[PDB]
Amino acid sequence: LYLQNY
């Protein structure tokens, strides 16, 4: 589980 917000 991986979340990246940019």
Distance CA 2, CA 5 (A): 10
Tokens 């990246």 appear where?
4
4 φ, ψ (degrees, to nearest 5): -125, 125
Chain breaks in the chain following residues, C–N > 2.5 Å: none
Burial 1-6 (b: 16+ CB within 10 A, else e): eeeeee
Output the six-digit token pair for 5.
Answer: 């917000």
Distance CA 6, CA 4 (A): 7
**Resolution of this structure in Å:** 1.5
Output the six-digit token pair for 4.
Answer: 């990246």
Method: X-ray
Tell me how far apart the terminal alpha carbons of the chain are, to the nearest angstrom: 17
